[PDB]
Amino acid sequence: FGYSDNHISTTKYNFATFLPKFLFQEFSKYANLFFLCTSAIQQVPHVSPTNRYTTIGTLLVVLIVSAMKECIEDIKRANSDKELNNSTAEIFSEAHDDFVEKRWIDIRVGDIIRVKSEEPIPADTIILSSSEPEGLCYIETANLDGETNLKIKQSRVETAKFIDVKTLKNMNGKVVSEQPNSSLYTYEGTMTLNDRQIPLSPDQMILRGATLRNTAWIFGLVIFTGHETKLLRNATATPIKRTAVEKIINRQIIALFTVLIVLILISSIGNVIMSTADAKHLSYLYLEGTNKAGLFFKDFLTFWILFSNLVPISLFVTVELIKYYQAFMIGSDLDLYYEKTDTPTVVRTSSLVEELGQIEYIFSDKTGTLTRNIMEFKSCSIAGHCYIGIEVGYRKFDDLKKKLNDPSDEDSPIINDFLTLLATCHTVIPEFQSDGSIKYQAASPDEGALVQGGADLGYKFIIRKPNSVTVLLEETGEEKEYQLLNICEFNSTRKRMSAIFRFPDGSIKLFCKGADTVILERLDDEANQYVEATMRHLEDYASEGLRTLCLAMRDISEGEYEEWNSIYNEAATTLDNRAEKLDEAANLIEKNLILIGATAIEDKLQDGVPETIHTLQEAGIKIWVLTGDRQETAINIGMSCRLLSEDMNLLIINEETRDDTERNLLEKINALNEHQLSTHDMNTLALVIDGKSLGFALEPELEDYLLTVAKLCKAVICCRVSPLQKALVVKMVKRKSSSLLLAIGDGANDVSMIQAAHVGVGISGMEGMQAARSADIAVGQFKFLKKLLLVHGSWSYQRISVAILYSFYKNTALYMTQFWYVFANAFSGQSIMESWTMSFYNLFFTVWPPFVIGVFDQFVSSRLLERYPQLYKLGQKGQFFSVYIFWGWIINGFFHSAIVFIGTILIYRYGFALNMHGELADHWSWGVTVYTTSVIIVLGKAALVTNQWTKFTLIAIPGSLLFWLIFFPIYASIFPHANISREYYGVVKHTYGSGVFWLTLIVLPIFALVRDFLWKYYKRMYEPETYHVIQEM
Amino acid sequence: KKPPNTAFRQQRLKAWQPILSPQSVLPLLIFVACIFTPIGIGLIVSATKVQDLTIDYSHCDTKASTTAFEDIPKKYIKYHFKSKVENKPQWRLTENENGEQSCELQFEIPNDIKKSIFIYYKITNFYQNHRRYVQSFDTKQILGEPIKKDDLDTSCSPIRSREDKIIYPCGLIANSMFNDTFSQVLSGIDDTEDYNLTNKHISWSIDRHRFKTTKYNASDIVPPPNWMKKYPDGYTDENLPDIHTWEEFQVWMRTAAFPKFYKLTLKNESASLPKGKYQMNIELNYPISLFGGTKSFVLTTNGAIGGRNMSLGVLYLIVAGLCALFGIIFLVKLIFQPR
Ligand SMILES: *[C@@H]1O[C@H](CO)[C@@H](O[C@@H]2O[C@H](CO)[C@@H](O)[C@H](O)[C@H]2NC(C)=O)[C@H](O)[C@H]1NC(C)=O
Ligand SMILES: *[C@@H]1O[C@H](CO)[C@@H](O)[C@H](O)[C@H]1NC(C)=O
Ligand SMILES: *[C@@H]1O[C@H](CO)[C@@H](O)[C@H](O)[C@H]1NC(C)=O
């Protein structure tokens, strides 16, 4: 009754429920809940060493930026939901006349709607009638199923007559329907239209996200709508995947919380030791608080607020702001954009841009991803002959001469029947066009390649009614009338399909095609005359990598057509098992055939695929390819798409139910005891598996048992694999021996395979769309994986690693001066700086140096990052970011921090460092002296860990220094006369008017960039690495 | 659709790259060391040019003389004059029952120091930078506003209120200030100068705008308990401290960063200090036992840095050493390593 709205449930918030869900999403984390609880402990009186509105202020700013990015992206989400939601819905008026143009929002229980062509269906409907007189309609499932076959949507016979507006005014009835479960091919419904029992089959089940293609209009009785359909109840939440860089951010923040509680234990235990030792000499504090453990608690909180900025607030919001901006920068790339299909390489998951830089086990679909899904009719093993260079395009004119020599050619009626089979027998639907040609609604691309392959020799298939005669368009003659008598459809275990046809002279013949191992067993072929040639030309087609079917025919007499018309007609009334009795019948007549020949359509490899697979294998990646193809054709594919180099090992495994231990254990023996050089044995290793052998291999009894031989090879190809074991391969490799994956597909059988990888990739373009939506990156062609993965993987991984690691450095290098001052004072908890430059440091001045490192830092140029794929191996193994390098950047923070503290202790010795008059540099003048010097060491280290850095980073690395040196007289001159920072009175005159303040800013930052600058010069001239050499090549 | 083809958008931005060839790192170290040697030498010149004097007078009451100018221990005086001191400085104690153990220090200036002279007091081991100590002053109540009870800044909490009265200079800074009163005159003995000082223009210019004379009726307020001794009857309409006029309160309120701090009391800038023997009389009111350490008085001048601190000059020399220590190691390792 009260149904929901028309939006795909990728929703994050609503306008009322924004606050508890978003604040639970941010405050379910650690580095925001920490500052929530320091801001909540900071409200205790006489405990805050800094302020209250400092930490709740910058935590509030971080929450506002997180709600800004989440608000923009969810408004873009709802903008797409308004691109789908606002759709024209002509709805029937019960009171007044014909279907009116309304919006979507007038759809309820049992609504009768008429929706037109070339526009999407609103929701689940039941067909009562359509523009066609039978009530069936033509539609395609762009959003539902992925298979592009236009469904023959049949309707109920007793309701098909209701067409006009006057018809369905006395038409209403209750429809007890199926429960809203997501069984796609199962329905149960009843109907009492005129107090008569009307059952409902799942055939009249136009679903939600379909687009009506070719009628004039369709009717629909809506059952379920909103989030109740069979497309919107199985809407996958797509749970977020924590990358390989942020699990170690989690334990990295655990490391900073460890060093924090070490600083507060050392510090506050020092406060108990000095505050109870120097009790005679600290009677000018009036410490008559008798609770010494109570003052240990209060002072413990003064240090838990005082050091609390060592963990940064504006890292995890800055990381997500950089990594989303890297996701923007990848999507706006000319070299990742294929303009023929016009797909602007969008990145669906912006949080996995880093994951492009550790990938070891790229998985792949062969059908359409590698092979483009364009079925070109290449060759045909015709009359037991082929081109034996390849000249089948020129040999096909000798096939035309084979037909045109009708007085003297034995093969000419046989090739008449050949072109008859690939001009008549199919399941595809013809389609008239505006041009002077015809285009085929291909229910099978093989069949459309056959019929268009006949159309290349002048066999234009004219439209064919399912219960009438048909005609053709022959090149030599004019027109020839054929007949649709009987069809015998294709099945998986049947491995063939046949048809019974009537030539116009009365000769009713059988015509059958299918695979070699079934059609090549029910045959005679005139005492096997054209069978050995058929075998050796199948093996020629299995030596070329072409999709190949076999062709045959036989005869039916009059009595066999009469009695077999009876057994075929009463054999086709079965609704119990439609695929069993019709195939037992459909091979009662498939004995002792006459073989004709074979067909061979090619599925051409795409534009950049072998170069891509070769350069990806040179980058240390173990590329796998998952397909449903057979052995020798896929070995020709991998031999042709650079998976299989010359004289590669090719561990063939074609096992059975319990044949596992022989090839598995004996290839463990030959994988271990046959120990070759293992450097040229490694790069010449492969594995070719049958998916039926792999079906009893992906199981917890024998999983790592297969992983020991699986991980050793360079390119593992799998053959004849059902689409469940794609996802079982992906989960199998991510569960044991946890490396960083990637999975590619372009079909709706790949969604369990793309949604399970460490980073999923879908392919747009051809008839699949479920992959490019349910991915992490949508990609035009497989060639884009090379520059995207190598180039933008190395770029994104290095830049985000030095951005994160630098951010930990800069916060350590500021607030570690707050720790070294605990020894200078009475272990008290005195903030060196004023309260608000604390909150302007990690939010307002040093927020731009991590950004331009995280985005605008070319550590090695892309023109020689893909001319040396070996460089991708150094990002892959786990360089540039660890816990060891993390403590290198922390202890660089301790050395630079203590050199600023100790250096500025010894410069401002007694406070007496002024030459203006006899006045002295107080607490706060020294405080902004160590603050300013710590800024110059921090963007000094930022200026030393950048490379290829001019444009938007000279606005950031010197822009933060000059922006602080301009901000500080403005803030500390204007703002102390506002009762907000009453600690900066005269600090501008006693620092910027000082003689010795700028001297400290000149030399003392250099005195840490000696270790920084000379370590950098040492490890790229005298102890270089690979990329240090390649940066000048 | 098609993304644009600007130089920014396609990661093709114009970029110079710092290459660390030894043709651009060795002139950087030679240039940095060769530009930090004249300024390090120049600032050790302008950090040894000053001629200070520093006499610890903490042990003048128990280590006393009380009858004549006896000699001082060597461990107290740290003089750094240009010329050499002929007669080592003496001191004595006096007690006229009103001064209460005033201390006549007597020092010998060896040559006439020409720069403006400044007399400080150094206090060691006085944590003026405690967390409970740079707070604990009501900012409104030192602005002169008659702030009532319970409207005060609560950071003054132990020195905030008394017997149904408020303390006008509340809190930990205003209480327990350095109340040893220096003599305004360097008394030139044996007829040399009889040298005058001032305690005017001593504090910060912004403290002399922020510290204003009060507006209380002088009967609701009470002095803080340590210098309750100088106001034994309490605050009255006559003896009330004008904070804008006092100008030694507002050098003690401006809290220094460290436990080892100077604080300015006296100076002279319009006349030189001649080369005679001087004495200075220091009324010992402030006990040692309150804080922990020493309390000297300092008679210093100024240089480029403030007084005698060679640490920034030698802190340029460590940089100009380590940019010519590795600027030679990275040239010996540039010639002899590909040798
Ligand atoms: C100088 O200051 C000291 C401490 O700041 C004062 O000594 C205190 O005086 C009061 C009142 O006589 C006593 O109750 C305290 O016990 C003293 N504290 C000590 C001795 O540590 C001293 O009175 C001041 N001298 C003046 C104002 O002339
Ligand atoms: C400086 O000393 C001379 C001589 O003792 C004196 O005349 C002059 O007034 C003093 N100046 C100040 C500002 O105290
Ligand atoms: C200068 O010193 C003499 C010495 O007794 C003193 O009387 C006089 O007041 C001083 N002048 C000032 C401080 O202006």
Residue numbers in the entry:
A (entry chain A): 196 to 583, 597 to 1241
B (entry chain E): 21 to 359
Report text from the authors:
The yeast lipid flippase Drs2p-Cdc50p is primarily found in the trans-Golgi network and is involved in protein trafficking between that network, the plasma membrane, and endosomes. Drs2p belongs to a large family of Type IV P-type ATPases (P4 ATPases). These enzymes translocate specific phospholipids from the extracellular side of the plasma membrane or from the lumenal side of internal organelles to the cytosolic side, creating and maintaining lipid compositional asymmetry in eukaryotic cell membranes. Drs2p-Cdc50p is activated by the binding of phosphatidylinositol 4-phosphate (PI4P), the Arf guanine nucleotide exchange factor Gea2p, and the Arf-related small-GTP-binding protein Arl1p to the C-terminal region of Drs2p9,10.
We obtained the activated complex by incubating the purified sample with 26 μM PI4P for 15 h at 4 °C, resulting in a cryo-EM structure determined at 3.3 Å resolution. We found that in vitro activation by PI4P was a very slow process; incubating the protein for a shorter period, say, 1-2 h, led to a mixture of activated and inactive conformations. Compared with the autoinhibited apo form, the active Drs2p-Cdc50p shows two major conformational changes: (1) the inhibitory C-tail of Drs2p is fully released from the extended horizontal groove in the regulatory A, N, and P domains of Drs2p and becomes disordered, and (2) the putative substrate-translocating path becomes more open, especially in the cytosolic side. In the structure of the active Drs2p-Cdc50p, the entire Drs2p C-tail becomes disordered, thus vacating the ATP-binding pocket of Drs2p previously occupied by Phe-1275 and Phe-1277. The A, N, and P domains in the activated conformation have all undergone rigid-body movement relative to the inhibited apo structure. Notably, the A domain, previously stabilized by the last stretch of the ordered inhibitory C-terminal peptide, has moved about 6 Å away from the P domain and has become partially flexible, as indicated by its weakened EM density. The A domain movement exposes the nucleotide-binding pocket in the N domain at the junction of the A, N, and P domains, perhaps priming the Drs2p structure for ATP entry, which is required for the lipid-flipping activity of the enzyme complex. Further, the rightward movement of the P domain has moved the cytosolic ends of TM3-6 by 1–2 Å, thereby resulting in a much more open substrate lipid-binding site in the cytosolic side. In the PI4P-activated structure, we found that this α-helix has swung 90°, away from the cytosolic regulatory A, N, and P domains on the left. Conceivably, such a swing motion will pull the inhibitory C-terminal peptide out of its horizontal groove and release it into solvent, hence releasing the inhibitory grip of the C-tail on the regulatory region.
